[PDB]
């Protein structure tokens, strides 16, 4: 029709903490470490229904997320094998007549390491809809925020793959994605460069 | 002072619709047959004095009351039509608007999706679904309106004119959204009733 | 050193049951036609080791795992009857018990209430049902068994046999609960099937 | 950075009902009657992470609230000793290079008393996200809405202090702060007078 | 074969009680001045039927309906005393019990705690409190009854007799619990009224 | 005043992850790492009200948990310095007239390390009332069940002291206490060794 591709973001193999987080937090069918994964945001939001039905029928792919927000909607599919995910992705692009590149770039609205987290700051992040692991006092904190939000998952994945960090929280919905990780001062800075390179990769497309 | 955005009067509520309202409302629970009046005004803080007025006028019961970012919704209902309409005219008289000064009802989505898969059916059933269970194999009617509250009258008629099942009605925020299930033939007919109901709202 | 409370096998999940566990389970989700298996052992904490044993033996998925006070519940499921049966036999070998060492399924309530009041339907819908809404004027069948886990299989053969609407299944704790809706002829036929399944089970 | 000061609201002594409301609706460390309190809203909202770390390391103050919204974010510190609270306050002000007066003015969105509340009106307010006390039918109802949201906590403290009213609810996030208090006609009238007197003092900055 | 566990008749609801019930009840909601009736029966599941009869009898609404593992609780209420008394008499004739057949109300706890510390008020406030806020420095009446259904009538009389504030009345389970705030004098009056009400109840 | 003493467990310094878990799910004042901690279960469980008033009113101690159940009640107090916690203990103990050894023995109802946790099994543990860190597939899992429940907190404390494990969960209320810890095959057996150790002492009363 007139569907704007806003996020197309593809992870070929989910890192273990990231998949575990999606499994625990997800309202749909659950992924496990190693599953390929496709995140998509389109506008208008309601178009997520037709596209999800198209994606689910083409392959053996399973639906992980589906949400209709005000201006846009989000869907995520995932399968043990890369093939089905990209095969369903093509279907979605061919139906909306968009190339992947027609996607929106990924603004970095906040990127920061915070060293020596107080126990009060940690307690606060840990009580507020925290579905991942416990942020612990004294450790360092990578925090990142993007616009659009869907990209935070892939950023989060490359962070974990590149650095011995612990995943605290991935908020992938709404207008702004947000990723919180914990680790030593040195681990978290590795996590940050990678995620910045991953973001660098997307923008060039 | 006050602007009237939604004014949607339902003279008698279909059983599923009323049952769903009763199952999700945090007010006084409607039953099938109840008359029912949806009103959204702006600023949102006004529904307080406005609900006070409607409630003090008649024997009518308050079903909903939400004050949102830019506007608020209020919902009254009673087994006697005249009580609901009487409260309605009283609310209009306070804000000094005619039932016609409401915003038109724009359609932001109308679609049927045939042969729903299990996965797609479950995601819907698992997230904010307080109605009945969407089942794989059936066709899905989905309807989105701006402003939201009109979706209730559209949901009500579509249950009258067609043999469909209520999955979900979300009547708050900027966008109303509706999900009904059934045979391709049923859900197409449920779409026409909603298309018609909206058209009559547009005539104001 | 473990006692085998519930063993219950379902070769092919009825659609509405699969959609209900899919919408209410905190594990991996089933689709219609899936094969399913329900286990309750005592001590309760035995379910972890057994879920490890069963998950490793095949491609089967884990739909529920709950350690309760007296005992512990677990539910595996797969698209093929073979992986479900293969994993259940492994769990039997490990606890050193045959399938018929399970406890009998005691019916502790069975009743059909025709012409459900709207108030009565409204209360049942509000109190945490994840299924379909109980509509007023229709007939209700409620059943309750001890132990709970069998209720899922009774819910399954009841949908197999009768054109009812599932409303609520509760498979954890001491007593299981089934809630169905339909016409009198529909609800009567389901209660008959459900009764028949439980007699089947009690033959071991 | 280019951090923006939106709300700087200092309370010297927390009123009992208000302290008790915050101890019940907040997800941090909890306040008691008499604690000094400071509420800061800054833009962009991810900045509240560094600013909070700065505050907990400067003094012994504790963290009550920490919330990141899309365009802005909000924090709240408190300690028995007002010293520590204003000290931690100045440390935040130095990092953002903003004086207290640089804060946004408090505009009144809504300001109403409604007499003789019906039982149905009362119930819906009691049933939706109210964490203060029950609103009873017959009594009068004072409702105040302010923009930005953070100053509603200072109006709520001054209202409770000046008049014998009951706190029903204070919502201090989003764009608009909303406050619900119950009393007689006279009690809510005094409370409403105290509210606007505090908003005007603030707006002298 | 139904055992009358509780039968507690409230002629008229005090506003904090009525307000509390309306904010925490999952069913239809009361207002100050309604009559109101609590019933516990065994077995639990018998409450559906007994709700069914009570609603048919008069114009009474259904306030609460909860099926515990061993017993079940229902709550009907109406603006007028006539309809509650009549609808309850019908419940009694069905189960073939007089009101006297109800279980004596025992007091498992009755205590005032004066000058409540902040951390104590805060823990009570945050954990399942739907009444008004408990503030520090004040006195706290707590009462625990067995059976639980009576704590509601003890909460009515206590509020009626003292100038106290209602914090919580949890009326399900085996144990009733009441929490109320006030000066140490008002809480001692609220407790003595409660004590007397139970005495009057077991006088029959 | 006829009060049974069911659990009396003193924790001299809360290990970091355990303090952080209590903090995420505590509904009183939150403990920070390093705090001392005293868990008490008494029957009739309505008695924890006075016993918390006594304990609070005697020292700087803070109330972290308090619950009334059918057969008993549980309270927990905690503070920066151990002197206050222990003193409040004696105030409590003398108020109910029992000594520290009048506590029930702590029977170990289940103890197991399960190696190579599958993703499915890890996911379902993560989805159900999990408020610690993510259990991750392939790692080993320590599980512990005690009766009464309050001791699982010292067992969890000690098992974090002696071992380099991760805390996933600790259900410290009801009849039975349940504890889920993660690590390699070496870290979980050490933790379990600490766990058996600490209970052995508790059983000497």
Residue C172 to chain E, least CA–CA distance (Å) = 12
Which residues of chain D are within 8 Å of residue B53 when distances are taken between CB atoms? none
Cα separation, B89 vs B57, whole angstroms: 10
The secondary structure of residue F99, as a DSSP letter, is -
Tell me whether D133 touches chain E (CB under 8 Å).
yes
Strand partners, C179: C142, C168
Which residues of chain C are within 8 Å of residue B119 when distances are taken between CB atoms? 31
Cα separation, F183 vs F191, whole angstroms: 9
Between chains, do F46 and E144 touch, taking CB under 8 Å as contact? yes
Which residues of chain F are within 8 Å of residue A33 when distances are taken between CB atoms? 119, 137
Beta strand ranges found along F20-85 (DSSP E): 36-43, 62-68, 73-79
CB-based contact F12:F161 (threshold 8 Å): no
Question: In a 10 Å sphere around its CB, with 0-12 CB exposed, 13-18 middle and 19+ buried, how is residue C128 labelled?
Answer: exposed
Sequential DSSP letters for C128-141? T--SPPPPTTSEEE
Cα separation, A129 vs A146, whole angstroms: 19
Best CA proximity match to A112, nearest among A196, A22, A204:
A196
Residue E119 to chain D, least CA–CA distance (Å) = 8
Task: List the single residue in C108, C113, C126 with the smallest CB-CB distance to E49.
Answer: C113
Cα separation, A168 vs A180, whole angstroms: 5
Q: How many residues does chain A have?
A: 205
Tell me whether B119 touches chain A (CB under 8 Å).
yes
Residue F26 to chain E, least CA–CA distance (Å) = 9
The secondary structure of residue F126, as a DSSP letter, is H
Do chains D and F have 3 or more beta-carbon pairs under 8 angstroms?
Answer: yes
Best CA proximity match to A113, nearest among D50, F20, D93, D92:
D50
Nearest CA in chain A to F125: A24
Beta-carbon contacts of residue F20 (< 8 Å; ≥ 6 apart): A119, A122, A123, A126, A134, A135, A136, A137, F33
Tell me whether E172 touches chain B (CB under 8 Å).
no
Cα separation, A104 vs B87, whole angstroms: 49
Q: Could you tell me how many CB contacts below 8 A there are between chain D and chain E?
A: 72
Task: Report helix, strand or coil for F133.
Answer: coil
Residue C22 to chain A, least CA–CA distance (Å) = 9
For strands B139-146 and B176-182, give the pairing: antiparallel
Run of H or E including E179: strand E176-182
Best CA proximity match to C51, nearest among C32, C27, C30:
C27
Best CA proximity match to C160, nearest among C7, C30, C6, C17:
C17
Tell me whether A140 touches chain F (CB under 8 Å).
no
Nearest CA in chain C to B136: C15
Cα separation, E146 vs E106, whole angstroms: 5
Tell me whether C172 touches chain E (CB under 8 Å).
no
Q: Does the CA dihedral E28-E33-E35-E38 come out positive or negative? A: positive
CB-based contact E136:E105 (threshold 8 Å): no
Residue A124 to chain C, least CA–CA distance (Å) = 26
Cα separation, C118 vs B30, whole angstroms: 10
Between chains, do F114 and C48 touch, taking CB under 8 Å as contact? yes
HEC string for chain B: CCEEEEEEEECCCCHHHHHHHHHHCCCCCCCCCCEEEEEEEECHHHHHHHHHHHHHHCCCEEEEEEECCCCEEEEEEECCHHHHHHHHHHHHHHHCCCHHHCCCCEEEEEEEECCCCHHHHHHHHHCCCCCCCCCCCCEEEEEEEECCCHHHHHHHHHHHHCCCEEEEEECCCCCEEEEEEECHHHHHHHHHHHHHHHHHHHHC
Best CA proximity match to A76, nearest among A89, A85, A65, A87:
A65
For strands C72-78 and C139-146, give the pairing: unpaired
Residue F112 to chain C, least CA–CA distance (Å) = 9
Task: List the single residue in E45, E51, E55 with the smallest CB-CB distance to C109.
Answer: E45
Tell me whether D121 touches chain E (CB under 8 Å).
no
Question: Which strands, in side-by-side order, build the sheet including B176-182?
Answer: B106-113, B139-146, B176-182, B165-170
CB-based contact B151:B177 (threshold 8 Å): yes
Sequential DSSP letters for F148-185? SGGGHHHHHHHHHHSS--EEEEEE-SSSSEEEEEEE-H
Q: Does the CA dihedral A49-B21-B43-D73 come out positive or negative? A: negative
CA dihedral F90, F94, F97, F99 (to 10 degrees): 30
The secondary structure of residue E180, as a DSSP letter, is E
Cα separation, E181 vs E184, whole angstroms: 9
The secondary structure of residue A174, as a DSSP letter, is T
Cα separation, B49 vs B43, whole angstroms: 12
Beta-carbon contacts of residue B14 (< 8 Å; ≥ 6 apart): B32, B156, B159, B160
Question: Taking CA D74 as the corner, what is the angle to CA D72 and CA D76, rounded to the nearest 5 degrees?
Answer: 165
Q: Does the CA dihedral A145-A147-A150-A154 come out positive or negative? A: negative
Question: In a 10 Å sphere around its CB, with 0-12 CB exposed, 13-18 middle and 19+ buried, how is residue E203 labelled?
Answer: exposed
Tell me whether E29 touches chain B (CB under 8 Å).
yes
CB-based contact A161:A187 (threshold 8 Å): no
Residue E26 to chain C, least CA–CA distance (Å) = 6
Task: Report helix, strand or coil for D189.
Answer: helix
Question: Which strands, in side-by-side order, build the sheet including F140-147?
Answer: F107-114, F140-147, F177-183, F166-171
For strands A62-68 and A73-79, give the pairing: antiparallel
Cα separation, C40 vs C201, whole angstroms: 15
Strand partners, E107: E145
> Is the preceding peptide bond at D38 cis, omega within 30 degrees of 0?
no
Q: How many residues does chain D have?
A: 205
Best CA proximity match to A173, nearest among A33, A24, A55, A40:
A40
Residue D85 to chain E, least CA–CA distance (Å) = 20
CB-based contact A87:A56 (threshold 8 Å): no
Residue C169 to chain E, least CA–CA distance (Å) = 14
DSSP percent split of chain D into helix, strand, coil, nearest 5: 40, 30, 30
Beta-carbon contacts of residue C2 (< 8 Å; ≥ 6 apart): C41, C42, C43, C46, C95, C97
Question: Taking CA F72 as the corner, what is the angle to CA E6 and CA F8, rounded to the nearest 5 degrees?
Answer: 175
Beta-carbon contacts of residue A201 (< 8 Å; ≥ 6 apart): none
E1 CB neighbour count, 10 Å cutoff? 7
Cα separation, C169 vs C21, whole angstroms: 8
Phi, psi of A31 (to 5 degrees): -90, 170
From residue B74, alpha-carbon distances to C115, E166, F76 in Å are 32, 29, 45
Run of H or E including A11: strand A4-11
Give me the half-sphere count of Cα atoms (radius 13 Å) on the Cβ side of residue E161: 19
Cα separation, B117 vs D13, whole angstroms: 59
CB-based contact E159:E167 (threshold 8 Å): no
Cα separation, A58 vs D4, whole angstroms: 49
Cα separation, B47 vs B41, whole angstroms: 7
Which residues of chain E are within 8 Å of residue B29 when distances are taken between CB atoms? 27-29
Tell me whether F28 touches chain C (CB under 8 Å).
no
Cα separation, A112 vs A178, whole angstroms: 12
Q: Which chains touch A (3 or more CB pairs under 8 A)?
A: B, C, D, F
Sequential DSSP letters for E69-119? SS-EEEEEEESSHHHHHHHHHHHHHHHT--GGGSPPPEEEEEEEE-S--HH
Task: Report helix, strand or coil for F9.
Answer: strand
Cα separation, E89 vs B146, whole angstroms: 51
Cα separation, B178 vs B21, whole angstroms: 13
Phi, psi of B143 (to 5 degrees): -140, 130
Which residues of chain C are within 8 Å of residue F141 when distances are taken between CB atoms? 48
Beta-carbon contacts of residue F52 (< 8 Å; ≥ 6 apart): E119, E120, E123, F63, F66, F75, F77
Q: In whole angstroms, what separates CA E126 from the centre of its chain?
A: 21
Cα separation, D80 vs D61, whole angstroms: 8
Cα separation, D67 vs B2, whole angstroms: 32
Best CA proximity match to A76, nearest among A94, A56, A101:
A56
Cα separation, F71 vs F69, whole angstroms: 6
Strand partners, C78: C35
Cα separation, F118 vs F97, whole angstroms: 49
Between chains, do E120 and F44 touch, taking CB under 8 Å as contact? no
Q: Which chains touch C (3 or more CB pairs under 8 A)?
A: A, B, E, F
Strand partners, A181: A142, A167
Question: In a 10 Å sphere around its CB, with 0-12 CB exposed, 13-18 middle and 19+ buried, how is residue A101 labelled?
Answer: exposed
Identify the residue among C25, C28, C34 best suited for mutation to test binding to A, counting A beta carbons within 10 A and taking the highest. C28
Strand partners, C107: C145
Q: Where are the alpha helices (DSSP H) in D71-118?
A: 82-96
Q: Which chains touch B (3 or more CB pairs under 8 A)?
A: A, C, D, E
Phi, psi of B66 (to 5 degrees): -135, 135
Nearest CA in chain D to E129: D131
CB-based contact B47:B76 (threshold 8 Å): no
Cα separation, C200 vs F99, whole angstroms: 57
Cα separation, E62 vs E73, whole angstroms: 11
Residue C36 to chain F, least CA–CA distance (Å) = 15
Cα separation, A175 vs E41, whole angstroms: 53
Best CA proximity match to D167, nearest among D143, D185, D148:
D143
Cα separation, D179 vs D169, whole angstroms: 6
Cα separation, E157 vs E190, whole angstroms: 8
Which residues of chain A are within 8 Å of residue C27 when distances are taken between CB atoms? 30
Strand partners, D36: D79
Cα separation, C149 vs D181, whole angstroms: 49
Strand partners, F7: F41
For strands B165-170 and B106-113, give the pairing: unpaired
Give me the half-sphere count of Cα atoms (radius 13 Å) on the Cβ side of residue B146: 6
Q: How many residues does chain B have?
A: 204
Cα separation, F44 vs D25, whole angstroms: 30
Tell me whether C64 touches chain F (CB under 8 Å).
yes
Tell me whether B104 touches chain C (CB under 8 Å).
no
Between chains, do C133 and B129 touch, taking CB under 8 Å as contact? no
CA dihedral D50, D51, D54, D59 (to 10 degrees): -150
Which residues of chain E are within 8 Å of residue F28 when distances are taken between CB atoms? 119, 122-123, 126
Cα separation, C63 vs C26, whole angstroms: 7
Which residues of chain F are within 8 Å of residue C65 when distances are taken between CB atoms? 121, 124-125, 128
Per-domain residue ranges of chain F:
1-104, 105-205
Cα separation, F90 vs F99, whole angstroms: 8
Which residues of chain F are within 8 Å of residue D28 when distances are taken between CB atoms? 30
End-to-end CA distance of chain D: 23
End-to-end CA distance of chain E: 22
Task: List the single residue in A24, A30, A167 with the smallest CB-CB distance to F130.
Answer: A24
Q: Which chains touch F (3 or more CB pairs under 8 A)?
A: A, C, D, E
Experimentally determined by: X-ray
Beta-carbon contacts of residue E199 (< 8 Å; ≥ 6 apart): none
Nearest CA in chain C to A28: C29
Task: List the single residue in B109, B140, B174 with the smallest CB-CB distance to A44.
Answer: B109
Best CA proximity match to A72, nearest among A166, A142, A8, A26:
A8
CB-based contact B9:B58 (threshold 8 Å): no
Strand partners, F181: F142, F167
Between chains, do B62 and D110 touch, taking CB under 8 Å as contact? no
Q: How many residues does chain F have?
A: 205
CB-based contact D127:B26 (threshold 8 Å): yes
Between chains, do F143 and C43 touch, taking CB under 8 Å as contact? no
From residue B201, alpha-carbon distances to B77, B159, B171 in Å are 19, 17, 16
Cα separation, F120 vs F124, whole angstroms: 6
From residue B125, alpha-carbon distances to A50, A66, C129, F128 in Å are 17, 11, 12, 19
Cα separation, B175 vs A69, whole angstroms: 9
Tell me whether B138 touches chain D (CB under 8 Å).
no
CB-based contact D125:D169 (threshold 8 Å): yes
Residue D167 to chain A, least CA–CA distance (Å) = 24
Task: Report helix, strand or coil for D131.
Answer: coil
Q: How many residues does chain E have?
A: 204
Cα separation, E114 vs E183, whole angstroms: 8
The secondary structure of residue C59, as a DSSP letter, is S
Nearest CA in chain E to C122: E27
CB-based contact C164:C191 (threshold 8 Å): no
Question: In a 10 Å sphere around its CB, with 0-12 CB exposed, 13-18 middle and 19+ buried, how is residue F106 labelled?
Answer: buried
CB interface of F with E, residues 36-55, below 8 Å = 44, 46, 49-50, 52-53
CB-based contact B51:B63 (threshold 8 Å): no
The secondary structure of residue E163, as a DSSP letter, is -
Phi, psi of E127 (to 5 degrees): -90, 100
């Amino acid at each position: 029709n007139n569907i704007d591709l806003r996020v197309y973001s593809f992870i070929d193999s989910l890192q273990p903490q990231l998949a575990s987080y999606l499994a625990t937090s997800s309202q749909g069918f659950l992924p496990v470490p190693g599953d390929a994964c496709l995140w998509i945001e389109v506008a208008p939001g309601m178009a997520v229904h037709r596209l999800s039905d198209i994606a689910l029928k083409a392959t053996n792919v399973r639906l992980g997320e589906q949400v209709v927000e005000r201006a846009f909607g989000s869907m995520e599919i995932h399968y043990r094998n890369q093939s089905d995910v990209l095969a369903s992705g093509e279907a979605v692009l061919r139906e909306i007549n968009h190339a992947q590149e027609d996607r929106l770039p990924c603004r970095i609205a906040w990127k920061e390491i915070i060293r020596a987290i107080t126990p009060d700051h940690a307690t606060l992040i840990n009580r507020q809809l925290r579905k991942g692991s416990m942020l612990l006092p004294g450790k360092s904190m990578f925090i990142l925020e993007t616009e659009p939000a869907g990209y935070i998952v892939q950023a989060a994945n490359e962070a974990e793959k590149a650095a011995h960090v612990t995943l605290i929280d991935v908020r992938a919905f709404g207008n702004f994605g947000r990723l919180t990780m914990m680790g030593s001062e040195a681990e978290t800075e590795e996590a940050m460069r990678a995620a910045e390179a991953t973001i660098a990769s997307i923008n060039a497309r």
